Structure 1
Amino acid sequence: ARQNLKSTDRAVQQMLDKAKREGIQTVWDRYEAMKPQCGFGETGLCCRHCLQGPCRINPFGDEPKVGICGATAEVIVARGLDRSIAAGAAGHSGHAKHLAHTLKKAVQGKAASYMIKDRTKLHSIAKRLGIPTEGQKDEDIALEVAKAALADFHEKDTPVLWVTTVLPPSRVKVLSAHGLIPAGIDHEIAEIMHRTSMGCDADAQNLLLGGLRCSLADLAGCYMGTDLADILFGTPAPVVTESNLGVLKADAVNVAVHGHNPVLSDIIVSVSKEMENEARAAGATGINVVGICCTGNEVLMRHGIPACTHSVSQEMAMITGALDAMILDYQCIQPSVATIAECTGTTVITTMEMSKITGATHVNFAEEAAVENAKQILRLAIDTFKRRKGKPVEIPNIKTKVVAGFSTEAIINALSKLNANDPLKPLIDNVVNGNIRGVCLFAGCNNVKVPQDQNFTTIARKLLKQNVLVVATGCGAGALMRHGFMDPANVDELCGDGLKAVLTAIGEANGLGGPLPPVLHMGSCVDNSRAVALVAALANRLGVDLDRLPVVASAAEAMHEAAVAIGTWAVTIGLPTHIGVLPPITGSLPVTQILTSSVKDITGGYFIVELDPETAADKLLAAINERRAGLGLPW
């Protein structure tokens, strides 16, 4: 097979060849077996919301033209999209909610493996929420922050504070005028599921306004998750590590942390260092913890744990034969891992009650027992390492250098070395003088339909040459790190002269004798909220709303419902937002026109649907430059 048609990652290509000769089916094989995919589903023109279905509508031609109950294409498309947004928001609800409970347990003395690690962030969040701190114990402040987090999930006397306190007042005012401020996170999720059920909401604009509001519930969960993880585990600062399959070590116990919620995998990291001598007794050099997906991003950002792989290529880590354990929480885990494990020897371990996989070993993680749980898990990994003594492994000797840890606090601190009391001003100065053309956030997944990483790297290369400041999260950050976009040694090759000058000036003032990396890694998918914090801080410093800023987003290879929700809130907060795969909307021209055009008149943002990455880069540059022109800037 030509493996480069599947993935642009050479380590992935090498493992695809191994999987092929060993007869191990991969995600790419399961995709091929699915073709041709259903065109009703692809276009959004299918409904299964009641037992009179399934209903479908022919995109073109003759009947069927309308659902059995009378639901039009507009209604069917908008209802399906709304449920996808609610599903995305629900994952972020679960992630943030878990962290809120963990913080509450910690400060109540119920979970001594957890603690307040970032006291400053705690007090800053309390202040933003209106919680008094003067003369209060940190534990009581944290109890109040956890209570406020849990309160945002349901209706109360205030709207969702993890929306209204994180966006500029002018933006909150626009959203409120259109009825878009969430009343409660789980409240909005449930209202979406109700209104999209049979015989309820049946007006495309009304449905889509509901979707915008639920996407802000997703934003609140993202921002709440980042806030609470930073309190518990530390706010990221710049770190240096490596990425790709070559971070695996044949002579070590290789343990991947995979999923999203690092609540236990932050603990796995710390415990793994304590069990080094137990690993050495078993014949290993040590325990080598590596990351997959956003749990991997979390521990990369906070501890420099190397990233093994991401998203669509996750099975390939197992194909090496050296992955002794894969420790799972939830979200973005291909359930194929449980069956591949039988072929590769890997011990796959689930840990969360609501996310089990038939055939995997389940360990019932509890914060109250986190260290004990981590030791049980790592001992299974050590046992597995011992079982592969003498077996050959094939780890591609392929890895890149990765500078990461660019939380918004870290970015502001780095800029403060150029201007101590007005840190955003050097960035704004360079936007104004054209050294920085604008900002682009790359976000979201890989998707088996797109050769892995091709859109992220093609678009990023064009933007960087045109002096765009590129930030990235999730598996977009994964794609860019695995292709060298987080290695400062590649600044000369990748970056336009203006951007290079700025990255160099910031780097030299931070004592690096070298530039910042070409792309700034801002963390996990919930950490898209960090990009919101940066952009809102810029808006406040400039006295304008986000829909006037030369800032865009690109979910260039989107897959998960999470990514749909994130793209939708990016639009809702005012950003031009590219999506590089087709969401199921093309079966309705009216819905497509709302999402790509008339929503501009509501929020100032809009979707740019473009599957060709060179064309998408041109459209993103045009959007940036239109914003520059609106501010009276050359472009």
Structure 2
Amino acid sequence: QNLKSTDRAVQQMLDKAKREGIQTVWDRYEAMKPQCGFGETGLCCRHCLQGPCRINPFGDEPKVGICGATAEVIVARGLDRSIAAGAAGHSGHAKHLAHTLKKAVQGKAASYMIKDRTKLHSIAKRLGIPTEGQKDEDIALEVAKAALADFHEKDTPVLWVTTVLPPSRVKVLSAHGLIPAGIDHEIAEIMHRTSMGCDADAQNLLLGGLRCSLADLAGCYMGTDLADILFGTPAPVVTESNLGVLKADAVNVAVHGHNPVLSDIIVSVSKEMENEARAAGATGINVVGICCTGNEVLMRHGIPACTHSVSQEMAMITGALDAMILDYQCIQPSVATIAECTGTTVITTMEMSKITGATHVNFAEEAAVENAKQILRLAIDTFKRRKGKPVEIPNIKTKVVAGFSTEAIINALSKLNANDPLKPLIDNVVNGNIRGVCLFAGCNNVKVPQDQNFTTIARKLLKQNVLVVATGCGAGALMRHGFMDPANVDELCGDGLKAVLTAIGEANGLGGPLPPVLHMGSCVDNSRAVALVAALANRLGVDLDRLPVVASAAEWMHEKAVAIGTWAVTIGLPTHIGVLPPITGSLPVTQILTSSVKDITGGYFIVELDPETAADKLLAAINERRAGLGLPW
């Protein structure tokens, strides 16, 4: 089971699932080998009914699609559609929050409100929305209307691109026509240009994809902005992660998916309903998090993370998981089947995200508290059905310090230098106590032993004094292996990194260092890391493609992560990817994405499947930037 997952709680539940006969994601993967080489390399097209068309990676015919599409067109078209699909996910999430804020400040959804008035005012100021003399409700109404307006063409480009990056970066991107005109506009134009008998030039296609990845960036940043206004900007919190956060004696409720508009209410309402839970014989309601919506309520409220990504089924295998409350994105549809064996109530809540066999509760912001009570009563019913049964909850869990928004990080640094908070961080880069910054992002992937690339690369970078930040299931992996525990700084961090983490933590009254890895939130909260990097570039007066900053999608899976990986490159970052995207069937395309893009944006993809080699390549990339700034290394 140790070739499946490096998580010990996960290995325990794999043994249970095996002997109970519950098929898992690793079983379904096994039943799928050997996988199709055509798809794996991207030499397959089904964009019309003359297809499917395949091209042999090597050898004789077929060498070309039926319409004449070459290998590089087919490969670039497929990649473009994954970027567009990822943008569509991050944009739908952000759109839903834009409507929720509009509804709230029009008096249409009283469960929702402007919780972070400071953030609302900086966002409105960043957008050129006038604040002085206006009600908060009116400023927020303007901000929501600007959010919705970035989805279509208008007099301006997408403001959640052009106002969040340094003007020098906006200029480099404009010169190549990469600035999105509208979020859903770019998504549609990609689907258009990649359909049969349209765009058939690899460079033209990939330039369209870079622009569409920036539409994804805009969706990510807008999602983070709106969630912070609605639900509070994260600040440092202490909690726990992994399966031992389940409690056999409580109604255990998992919030699972990506959009917190739902789960944040569940967190609030579940406290209300503790007495109703005690009456059925529970200690209370134990809300826990899965995937990125769990990270949302982890960053804001300190809700313990139960599990992530490829291993989500394992939470139900315990037999303790009474309800699993789903919005959308990255939910294995297998949970609906597996619940018939485990007793779990699987509840979908979102109109466009249903799973056959799951209970659906039609959630409306106008009725959020009504719906949350309805949902938590079903969980309480489910606990009663198992009241008495034996559960197997692995007694495994780690301590997690999280909540490192960009504002929290700046505030933390401001305790060493009140008037120039970025300077202490930069000073320690210059003198070498911080070699550079690495952002770990993205999913787990069944092809990679769970968390193996994340921890291996993280261990090597930290020993080399890299400041490591993390998001999404990359944060999930690092946290479940103790990387968000300050007590492991001594083991994990090099002396220079140790000193800076200790100096910052001691100055924030903790008598102890910051955690070895800074948890910056969910997948859309990759935009937080953009805000920090942009702030550092602006403070040093250079473009982002000169900073010693890199990214690692170490075990990535989802179309969202392809989009994220692609705008990481487009804003100027060397960007490591740990699972091959379907690109190797075309060397010209591979050459564009790993080398030639450097001359366009200054970022590039680093393809490397072996995590030790990946760490070396990421340190090289970081050290190359240091030398480019004239620093020692």
Matched with 2:91 is 93
Equivalent residues, number: 633
Once the two structures are TM-superposed, the CA of residue 330 in structure 1 deviates from its matched residue by 0.1
Residue 258 in 1 paired to residue 256 in 2?
yes
**1:313-370 deviation per Cα after TM superposition (whole angstroms, max 9, x unaligned):** 0000000000000000000000000000000000000000000000000000000000
Counterpart CA distance in 1 for 2:64 and 2:301 is 54
Per-residue deviation, 1:390: 1.4
Match in the other structure for 1:512:
510
Hey, what does 1:541 align to over in structure 2?
539
Residues 14-53 of structure 1, C-alpha deviation per residue, up to 9 Å, x if partnerless?
A: 0000000000000000000000000000000000000000
1:258 Cα deviation (Å)? Answer: 0.2
In 1: Cα distance, 2:392 partner to 2:511 partner? 37
Given candidates 467, 473, 476, the residue that maps to 1:469 is 467
Q: C-alpha distance in 1, partners of 2:287/2:595?
A: 46
Stretches of structure 1 lacking an aligned partner (at least 5 in a row): none
* Cα deviation digits, residues 86-130 of structure 1 (max 9, x gap): 000000110000000000000000000000000000000000000
Deviations 1:392-411 (A, max 9, x none): 10000000000000000000
- Map 1:19-168 → 2, pairs under 5 A: 19-168=17-166
Identity of aligned residues (%): 100
TM-score (norm: length of structure 1): 1.00
Task: Kindly provide the CA deviation profile for residues 36-92 of structure 1, in whole angstroms up to 9, marking residues without a partner as x.
Answer: 000000000000000000000000000000000000000000000000000000001
Residue by residue over 1:489-538, the C-alpha shift from the partner in whole angstroms, topping out at 9 and shown as x without a partner, is 00000000000000000000000000000000000000000000000000
CA distance in structure 1 between the partners assigned to 2:32 and 2:83 by the alignment? 25
Tell me the equivalent position of 1:411. 409
Q: TM-score, normalised by structure 2?
A: 1.00
**Counterpart Cα distance in 2 of 1:373 and 1:544:** 49
**Per-residue CA distance 1:405-452 (angstroms, 9 max, x = gap):** 000000000000000000000000000000000000000000000000
Following the alignment from structure 1 to structure 2, what is the Cα–Cα distance between the partners of residues 316 and 230? 31
Distance 1:376 1:121 in 2: 32
Taking the TM superposition and a 5 Å limit, the aligned residue runs for 1:384-463 are 384-463=382-461
Deviation of 1:586 after TM superposition, in Å, equals 0.2
Q: SS of the counterpart of 2:363?
A: coil
Distance 2:145 2:83 in 1: 26
Cα distance in 1, alignment partners of residues 485 and 586 from structure 2? 43
CA distance in 2, matches of 1:390, 1:31: 35
> Alignment partner of 1:34: what SS?
coil
- C-alpha separation in 2, matches of 1:553 and 1:398: 29
In structure 1, C-alpha distance between the alignment counterparts of 2:519 and 2:208, rounded to whole Å: 32
Residue 171 of structure 1, CA deviation: 0.2
Cα distance, 1:141 vs structure 2: 0.1
Alpha-carbon distance in structure 2 between the residues aligned to 1:358 and 1:109: 35
Alignment match of 1:231 (pick from 229, 232, 238): 229
The CA deviation string for residues 456-477 of structure 1, in whole angstroms up to 9 with x for no partner, is 0000000000000000000000
Q: Distance in 1 between matches of 2:47 and 2:452?
A: 36
**In 1, Cα distance between the equivalents of 2:558 and 2:187?**
17
Distance (whole Å) between structure 1 residues aligned to residue 460 and residue 537 of structure 2: 26
Measured after TM superposition, the shift of residue 202 of structure 1 is 0.2
SS at match of 2:369: helix
| 1:603-623 Cα shifts (integer Å, max 9, x gaps) | 000000100000000000000
- Runs of 4+ off more than 4 Å: none
Q: Counterpart of 2:609 in 1: which secondary structure?
A: coil
Q: CA deviation at 1:176?
A: 0.1
Deviation of the 1:561 alpha carbon:
0.2
C-alpha RMSD of matched pairs (Å): 0.2
Measure how far apart 1:234 and its partner are: 0.1
What CA distance in whole angstroms lies between the structure 2 residues aligned with 1:73 and 1:65? 8
User: Per-residue displacement from partner, 1:233-279 (whole Å, max 9, x unpaired)?
Assistant: 00000000000000000000000000000101000000000000000
Name the SS of the counterpart of 1:523 in structure 2.
coil
Spell out, residue by residue over 1:147-173, the C-alpha distance to the aligned partner (whole angstroms, 9 max, x if none): 000000000000000000000000000
Q: Deviations over 1:558-604 (max 9, x none)?
A: 00000000000000000000000010000000000000000000000
Report deviation, 1:312: 0.2
Match of 1:4, SS state, is coil
Whole-Å Cα distance in 2 between the matches of residues 179 and 71 of structure 1?
A: 25
The alignment partner of 2:92 has SS state of: helix
Please give the alpha-carbon distance, in whole angstroms, between the structure 1 residues aligned to 2:518 and 2:390. 37
- 1:389 is displaced (CA, Å) by 1.2
Shift of residue 371 of structure 1? 0.2
| Distance apart, 1:187 and its partner CA | 0.1
Q: How many Å separate the matches in 2 of 1:545 and 1:342?
A: 54
Q: Say which SS state the counterpart of residue 436 (structure 1) adopts.
A: coil
Unaligned residue ranges in structure 2 (runs of 5+):
none
Please give the secondary structure, in 1, of the residue aligned with 2:156. coil
Whole-angstrom CA distance in 1 between matches of 2:120 and 2:582: 41
Deviation by residue 1:530-563 (Cα, 9 ceiling, x = unmatched): 0000000000000000000000000000000000
Residue 133 of structure 1, CA deviation: 0.3
CA distance in 2, matches of 1:628, 1:459: 20
Q: 1:402 is paired with a residue of what secondary structure?
A: strand
Q: Which residue of 2 aligns with 1:332?
A: 330
Cα distance between partner residues in 1 of 2:365 and 2:280: 28
| SS of equivalent to 1:526 | coil
| Equivalent residue for 2:244, pick from 220, 243, 246 | 246
* Residue aligned with 2:260, SS: coil
Question: Could you tell me how far apart the structure 2 residues matched to 1:296 and 1:576 are?
Answer: 29
Taking the aligned partners of 1:5 and 1:463, their CA distance within structure 2 comes to 23
Instruction: State the distance in 1 between where 2:280 and 2:561 align.
Output: 42
Q: CA offsets, 1:301-320, max 9 Å, x none?
A: 00000000000000000000
